[PDB]
Amino acid sequence: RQNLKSTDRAVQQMLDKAKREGIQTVWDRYEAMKPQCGFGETGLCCRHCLQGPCRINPFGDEPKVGICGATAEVIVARGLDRSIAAGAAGHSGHAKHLAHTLKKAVQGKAASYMIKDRTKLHSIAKRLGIPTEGQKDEDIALEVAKAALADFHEKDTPVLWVTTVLPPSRVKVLSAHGLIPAGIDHEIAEIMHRTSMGCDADAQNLLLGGLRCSLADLAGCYMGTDLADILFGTPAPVVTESNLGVLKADAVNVAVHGHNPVLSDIIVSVSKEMENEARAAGATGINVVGICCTGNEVLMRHGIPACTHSVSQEMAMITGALDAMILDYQCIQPSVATIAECTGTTVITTMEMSKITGATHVNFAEEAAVENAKQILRLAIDTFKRRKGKPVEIPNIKTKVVAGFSTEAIINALSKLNANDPLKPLIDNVVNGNIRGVCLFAGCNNVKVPQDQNFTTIARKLLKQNVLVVATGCGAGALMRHGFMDPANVDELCGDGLKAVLTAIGEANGLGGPLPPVLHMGSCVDNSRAVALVAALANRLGVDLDRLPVVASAAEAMHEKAVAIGTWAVTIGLPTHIGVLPPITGSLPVTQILTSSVKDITGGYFIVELDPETAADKLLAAINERRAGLGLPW
Amino acid sequence: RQNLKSTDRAVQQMLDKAKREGIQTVWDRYEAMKPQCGFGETGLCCRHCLQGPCRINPFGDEPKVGICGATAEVIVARGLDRSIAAGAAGHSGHAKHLAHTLKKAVQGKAASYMIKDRTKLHSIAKRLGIPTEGQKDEDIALEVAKAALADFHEKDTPVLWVTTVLPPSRVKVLSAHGLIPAGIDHEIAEIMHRTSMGCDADAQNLLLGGLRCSLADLAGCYMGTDLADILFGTPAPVVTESNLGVLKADAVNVAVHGHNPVLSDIIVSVSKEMENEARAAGATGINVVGICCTGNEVLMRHGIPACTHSVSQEMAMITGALDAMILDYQCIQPSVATIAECTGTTVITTMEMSKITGATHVNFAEEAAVENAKQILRLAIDTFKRRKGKPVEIPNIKTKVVAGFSTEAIINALSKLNANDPLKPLIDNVVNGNIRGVCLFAGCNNVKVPQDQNFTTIARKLLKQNVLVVATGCGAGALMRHGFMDPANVDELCGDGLKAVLTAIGEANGLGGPLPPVLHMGSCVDNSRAVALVAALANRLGVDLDRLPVVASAAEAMHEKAVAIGTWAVTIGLPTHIGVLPPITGSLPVTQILTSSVKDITGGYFIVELDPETAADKLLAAINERRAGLGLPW
Ligand code: SF4
Ligand code: SF4
Ligand code: F3S
Ligand code: F3S
Ligand code: FES
Ligand code: FES
Ligand SMILES: [Fe+3]
Ligand SMILES: [Fe+3]
Ligand code: NI
Ligand code: NI
Structure with missing residues (x-):
């Protein structure tokens, strides 16, 4: 049965455990949702005003058009554009967080962070046109962080994290179609405006706007990589392991899940300091493992093993050995907060704009990163102790992973x-x-x-x-x-x-x-x-x-x-x-x-x-x- | 029959005309949409990822929760927050347009625009803390426009078009709850981020974010009023008329519809210059009339009569006497572009991000406002000539309106x-x-x-x-x-x-x-x-x-x-x-x-x-x- 749900054997094993324990999973919630709405599936639904909801039959008779006159073309393009803007808002919000963290670090306001990759810093400055000769590194980095923040709004130049990262001939093609973003958050807002009721109502025009907003997303992605490399090191080849078998019954297992290395990188370094504190609690040490992108970040830079990803994230908890799941934002199934009641896992949120009802919130401030990390890890240690003598079911399944190919x-x-x-x-x-x-x-x-x-x-x-x-x-x-x-x-x-x-x-x-x-x-x-x-x-x-x-x-x-x-x-x-x-x-x-x-x-x-x-x-x-x-x- | 649709007699009369002519209206498209989706009506639908669409039964059995685990609370709050951000994106995009127009005007780049209300300019500068003593008006206005643009992004101060417009005690209450916006487009983007999949999943937290984004909307509104008053004059009491009876069969009837006075104010002034050109075409003159907010703007400042509003906007076209409908953005039913084929009206869009398939597009540039206005009005004059000898049905229904209460x-x-x-x-x-x-x-x-x-x-x-x-x-x-x-x-x-x-x-x-x-x-x-x-x-x-x-x-x-x-x-x-x-x-x-x-x-x-x-x-x-x-x- 479980092979129709996941082709990963470790996931299949945990699906069997969840089933006999009565723990509802993402696959069960999907089954309960069937059949899904065909208007939504095809894009032919609009809720952009209080005259709605509006829908259009894919085929057949009325409704054929939205109440305000919006056609199928317009409705589909507007919904798509909003999805693009939402994605841009996530990748670029991540990048913005890192830009503020770099600024704080070099202004003396966050000593847990530093310029770790001087070579990357100078190459980014050169790519952007920022002078380096005779400048202190901290001043170069301040200028880079300010340039990053400036790309979020209109200014005298377009978004440099588009125009300085693609070849001139590509920039020229895009400029000819009006597709170069003027500012990252500017474009997000313009999408939300033009897709609101009674605004843009031409599919080609709407989609051109979407393409431009997608380049704002690219700029956010590239800015995020650039800044994370400066702060945490550009990846190089590294050997590690993946899948649920990287959990260890006799260690404090801590998953970092979500997105930003501002959080997961510090967890990794602080965890090594607290090894002896973990041993006093009867563990062998703290075993940090990755889920989703922030797992990828610490795998790429430090060889932290990856536990699982995306759709199967709940299965790490089902083992019974996941003592803590430390979150910042994006791609976290909120079901984790309720599943934790049954598995014993301590789910900890850390970001003001991303809380989950029932999860413990520990504010993380870059200015206090090490101390906030120790508070979080001590919750994990207490949780390990609470499972003294409880059997766990960690599938003994893992692969070897060579990664770090920046x-x-x-x-x-x-x-x-x-x-x-x-x-x-x-x-x-x-x-x-x-x-x-x-x-x-x-x-x-x-x-x-x-x-x-x-x-x-x-x-x-x-x-x-x-x-x-x-x-x-x-x-x-x-x-x-x-x-x-x-x-x-x-x-x-x-x-x-x-x-x-x-x-x-x-x-x-x-x-x-x-x-x-x-x-x-x-x-x-x-x-x-x-x-x-x-x-x-x-x-x-x-x-x-x-x-x-x-x-x-x-x-x-x-x-x-x-x-x-x-x-x-x-x-x-x-x-x-x-x-x-x-x-x-x-x-x-x-x-x-x-x-x-x-x-x-x-x-x-x-x-x-x-x-x-x-x-x-x-x-x-x-x-x-x-x-x-x-x-x-x- | 028509009284169930509108309580406005002039609208009822045009609904009768539309019915016998077979012209579909907003009310007909609403009837064709019934019964509307009860998931959408109640907020219990989510399309924030490609695992959806998800829905929750208001009552009864499954589905009870979204596929990722999102509860009814989360789904409802996320949808609401996105609506708030979309509204903020519209009002503040309007304000941003006016801020750039003021900057251009005082930099010598758009001589059709000017500081018309010096008193308003100085009072806004004083409210914001911008010095006026010994400064040229054009320099004060440059500083005001730059401050307006700065409120769209993070900086060393919060959004001044919130904090300088509410009493200190109210700002203190809001600050205590973290509700003061950091930047207008910043907050819009943060809403789109936090409401994307696997992010914020606590109803109270989500709604606090929405309240903060609503203050970004307020800042956009207030900025829009402030800048429009500087550029076009603060309203004072004025007497005019409203309803479809303000159209005149023997004049070129031009509706200004949409939102921004950057467009409608120039149409009003240029229209008076072209009176003799209209008379040469056999009209008495150009009769500018208002629809929706941009109609309100020119009613408040100039006493331009209001033709109609909102849901009944198509009925102005049904008279047969509306020669042109000049648009910028927001609240324009896109049905107008197709109805125009049957009524003879020339529908003209003017803004790059708000086009309607089938409508004539005339780019408007503030740098060329007068010339672009004449091109637009000459399309309207040609349209008046094309209806020589055609009967029109203008309901002889209007009210007296005293307005202008800034x-x-x-x-x-x-x-x-x-x-x-x-x-x-x-x-x-x-x-x-x-x-x-x-x-x-x-x-x-x-x-x-x-x-x-x-x-x-x-x-x-x-x-x-x-x-x-x-x-x-x-x-x-x-x-x-x-x-x-x-x-x-x-x-x-x-x-x-x-x-x-x-x-x-x-x-x-x-x-x-x-x-x-x-x-x-x-x-x-x-x-x-x-x-x-x-x-x-x-x-x-x-x-x-x-x-x-x-x-x-x-x-x-x-x-x-x-x-x-x-x-x-x-x-x-x-x-x-x-x-x-x-x-x-x-x-x-x-x-x-x-x-x-x-x-x-x-x-x-x-x-x-x-x-x-x-x-x-x-x-x-x-x-x-x-x-x-x-x-x-x-
Ligand atoms: S914007 Fe148009 S199509 Fe969408 S809900 Fe409102 S009336 Fe319906
Ligand atoms: S975000 Fe969650 S509730 Fe919304 S469509 Fe995706 S799986 Fe369904
Ligand atoms: S965007 Fe997709 S790639 Fe993984 S971390 Fe999120 S499920
Ligand atoms: S927001 Fe509403 S108030 Fe009128 S101009 Fe638009 S229908
Ligand atoms: S997604 Fe089902 S009718 Fe709206
Ligand atoms: S609004 Fe109808 S199920 Fe989505
Ligand atoms: Fe990711
Ligand atoms: Fe309006
Ligand atoms: Ni991803
Ligand atoms: Ni309105």
Whole structure:
């Protein structure tokens, strides 16, 4: 039975435990929701004013139009635009938090934080045009943080975290269509305005606004990665493990869940100090483990093992060994606060704008990060003690994970084959066919799709066709939990050409073995790292991104953030697969813009395909079409 | 039949014409939508991620909770918060537009605009703390415009268009609850973040965020009024007319519809220049008439007659005499673009973010306002010529309207009774019972309510109980179209005490007659004028706004902007009636917060009441409770 819910064996085992214990899960709540509303599924519902709710029958007779006259086209486009703005609001709110934290750190107001990556700080300053010669690091960083904050509002320049991160030719194409954001929060607000009742009512105009707001989301992502690297270190290759078997019955198990490394990075460092305090309580130590993006952040930088991801997050609690779940914001099922009553887990919120009824709230202030962390960890230690003598059921299931492939690390790895032209070995192998193209897997799991089934099915076909696969967020989580980040699986998973390249790079890096089958490029904001890599390739080749054999797949998408990311992938020029239905099919004109005529605007386009084998074929076709456009064999 | 749709006779006549001509109206589209979705009506629907749509049965069995675990409380509060943010995005986008226009004007970049009200400019600068002594007006205005723009983002001060417009004691109460906005667009974005999936999931916390975002909406409203007064003149009493009978078969009839006086003010002035050009085309002249808020703006400042409002806007076109409908944004039924095919009206959009498929778009640039206006008006003249010899059906129905009661004008009128303490005559008459209290009517019509029936039913009962009634937006539109702004109706409509006061003020102003039964305080952003009046009363009395016998009624609310306004009315301390159901009844805890326990936070509260006689009784009870709290008879 449980295989229809998740393809992860550890998740299946915990689903069996939840069932016999009567603990309701996300899958049970989904079953209880069926059949879901077909107006909502197709996008043909509007609640943007108190004359509503309005709906439109996909087919048949009336209602055919909204009460104010809004057509199916308008309703669908307005709902989509609001989702893009909501995603932009999340990624950029994360980035804004980090910008204020950096400012505080270098103003002397938060001594738990510091410039850890001086090289990253100077390179960002150079990219932005901020002078470094003869300046103190703290002054350079103050200027970077102020520039970050300035990109949220209108000013004399557009959003620099768009215009300084894409090639000039791409910026020119976007500017010609009016798509460069003027300010991050400015664009979010303009979306909410133009989609309110009696405002924008032309599908093309609305969708152009959405594309521009998606670039505000990209700017937030890139800003988040940049600032987190300065504060916490740019990732480099690291070896760790994933899945529920990383929990340890004899340790205090603490999950960091949510998004921002401002919180999870301090938890990691403070946890090591309190080891002896944990031992006094009868534990071996504090075992910090990751869930969702903030787990990815500490996996990428510190090798903290990943417990689980996205849709299966409740299953970590069902083991009975999760003593604490420490939260900041985004992608946290609020069910965790009630499940904790039955599992014993202490669920702790820390951010003023993200509370859950029934969860313990411990305000976290960057100015008091270490002390606030100790208060939180001491709640976890008390919880470990309370479970003295209780059996736990930790599935003895884990994989080996090689990760930490920031763009800097990928360039460094390649530089071992060509020191002064590090991108050339990659391009050479694209040209000779050893690498067919590149595919970025991104985004969530979604309860509608058996967990991980689309990521793994698509990835397997692409890897066998010599596609270089990179991954972020819970797409990276899916692939790591299924062995795709273990170099021991290269022979099984990779075509001969891809294997040759991964082996050549690995052996040049002293590994006596290959790079892993899939390169983990980090959290969801770290989709911006894939942008940096692709933009660097484009610049080295002297072509725009919409000529490169690079595609993206949000194969099991869920969050509004994933819609925003998919939309900016299209906007920067990529064929972009989405493996769940976004609420667009109720308007053929809108679907045709997003899947076809946007090619004429940005060169990218959505590929909506729920069958993963077919999605892989379509992604391969998109890659091979790009190869043919460059005059390459395929 | 038509009386169930609208209580306005002119609207009824045009509904008969639309019916025999087969032209579908908002009322027909509403009928086609019935029965509307009960999940949406109650707030128990969520589409915030691609696992949805989710719904919760108001009563009965499953579904009882959203797929991610979101409760009814969370779902209802998140939807409400998004509506507040959308309203804030509209009012503040309007204000932002005006701030950029003022900046351009005084930088020499838009010579069609200028500082028209020097007195207002200096008083705003003084309120904000901007020095004026020894400064050029253009420099003072540059500083005001920059301060306006700065309130959209975080900075070293909170939003000054909140903190400098409410009494210190009210700011202190709000600050204690964390409710002062940090930046207008900042708060909009934070709402969209915290309401996205897996973020804020505590109803009280979510609603506190909503209250804070409503204050960002108030700041946008107040900023909009302030800047429009500087650019276009602070209103003073003016006499005009309203309803469809203000159209003239032998003139070029041009409706200004939407919101921003940056557009409608120029149309008014340029139209007078082109009179002879219109006469050459066989017209008597150009007859500019108003619809919705931008109509209110030019009615308040110039006495431009109001044609119609809100829900009945299509009926102006049905006359056959509306040659042009000139739009910027907000509250425009997009049906107008298709109805125009059948009526001959030229519908013209002018703003980049607000287009309607099938409508002619004429970009308007403040830098070219006069020329762009002439292009627009020449389309209208061509349209008049095309209807040579066609019969029109203009209902011969109009009322007399005295309006222009800005807060400055109200203070000036009262100063004729007490020159150096102008608020005292008003307070004296509250104390002696000649004025029972004050009621602000605000907001839209809504197709669910027979048009104007709640505004007029409630207003009549309050006026008979000696309540001083003020009105804005389409509440003012409803009341003007039913004679409530004609001083000749004071004897019929007003209790003896109110009549005595209106007569005493009018006779002291040289009128030989009373002020009108209802004081028109302007457009919906000009709800901020009512705030200025109430805050001035509070300061003169040394008490906070939640002790004053002042209430608000959004008696037929529709737009997200009306939800935002109602919410900030509650947040500043007022009992606030809403005469349509907002999507809250699916959560009793949320309803109880908004109608009861918020009293303990801000002193205000919502009164949700769809029966207008009962609503009037509840508003009177709220007024009389405030009187009793002040130790006054009632
Ligand atoms: S905006 Fe138009 S379509 Fe949407 S709920 Fe209001 S009347 Fe219906
Ligand atoms: S956010 Fe939760 S309640 Fe809303 S659609 Fe997604 S799963 Fe359903
Ligand atoms: S952290 Fe969230 S946005 Fe998707 S990628 Fe994972 S569920
Ligand atoms: S202009 Fe719009 S917000 Fe309501 S008050 Fe009139 S319908
Ligand atoms: S009618 Fe179901 S989503 Fe609105
Ligand atoms: S189920 Fe009808 S509004 Fe969503
Ligand atoms: Fe994430
Ligand atoms: Fe309005
Ligand atoms: Ni994500
Ligand atoms: Ni309004």
